[PDB]
Amino acid sequence: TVSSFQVDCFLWHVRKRFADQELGDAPFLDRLRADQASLRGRGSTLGLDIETATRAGKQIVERILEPASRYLTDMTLEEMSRDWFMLMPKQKVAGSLCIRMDQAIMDKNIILKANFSVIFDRLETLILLRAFTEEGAIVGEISPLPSLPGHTDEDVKNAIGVLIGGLEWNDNTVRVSETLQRFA
């Protein structure tokens, strides 16, 4: 736990300069004040001096220091936070994507929007994809899963094809975003 105190004193000193120069922030200054108060309290019960602590924090932190992507959005944050429900649900998991749709839709023109990253000429990772009807109704969703594996473009295109097939079954004309038309 002494290492945590070393990092604490070192980070306090390196944060001192931010208030020493830039626009600063009154809560930031109060945080620094209460910080150094608690750090004096620690150094009292730990015994060691701060001049013998920041030097150790330097060598304890410096070792922790370390492909040109963008971000396209077809949906707003609201368009991905909106609630919904599938009356007759039809869902599964594929690789690392949760596919769901509503089977109770028919003869509806559907539009697929998506928000995701992009590298070079193709996708990298999908944040969310939902299916809307021309009358503004959510019917399908391809959500990412909290898995360490992840996903790339091939299985993403496969999931989109699965969704399009499941929708096109019930006489539903289905089209994708011009973005997905360009990248999938």
The three-state secondary structure class of 69 is coil
What b/e readout covers 16-26, taking b as 16+ CB neighbours within 10 angstroms? eeeeeeeeeee
**Taking every pair of C-alpha atoms in the chain, what is the biggest distance, in angstroms?**
77
Q: What's the CATH code, domain 1-66? A: 1.10.287.10
DSSP string, 80-144: HH-----SSEEEEEETTEEEEEETT--S--EEEEEEEEEETTEEEEEEEEEEEETTS-EEEEEEE
Residue 32 has phi, psi (to 5 degrees) of -65, -40
42/31 Cα distance (integer angstroms): 16
184/171 Cα distance (integer angstroms): 22
Q: Where are the domains of the chain?
A: 1-66, 71-184
Tokens of 12: 């306090």
Tokens of 52: 């013998």
169/163 Cα distance (integer angstroms): 10
- CB of 125 within 8 A of CB of 116? yes
**Residue 15: CB atoms within 10 Å:** 14
- Residue 170 carries which DSSP code? T
Query: What's the chain's Rg over C-alpha atoms?
Result: 26
Geometric angle at alpha carbon 66, from 24 and 62, rounded to 5°: 65
Please provide the distance, in angstroms rounded to a whole number, between the alpha carbons at the two ends of the chain. Answer: 51
Deposited experimental method: X-ray
- Residue 59 carries which DSSP code? H
Geometric angle at alpha carbon 37, from 35 and 39, rounded to 5°: 70
- CB of 69 within 8 A of CB of 124? yes
Resolution of this deposited model, Å:
3.9
- CB of 84 within 8 A of CB of 138? yes
Q: Cβ neighbours of residue 116 under 8 Å, at least 6 residues apart?
A: 72, 123, 124, 125, 126, 127, 129
Q: What's the CATH code, domain 71-184? A: 3.30.420.330
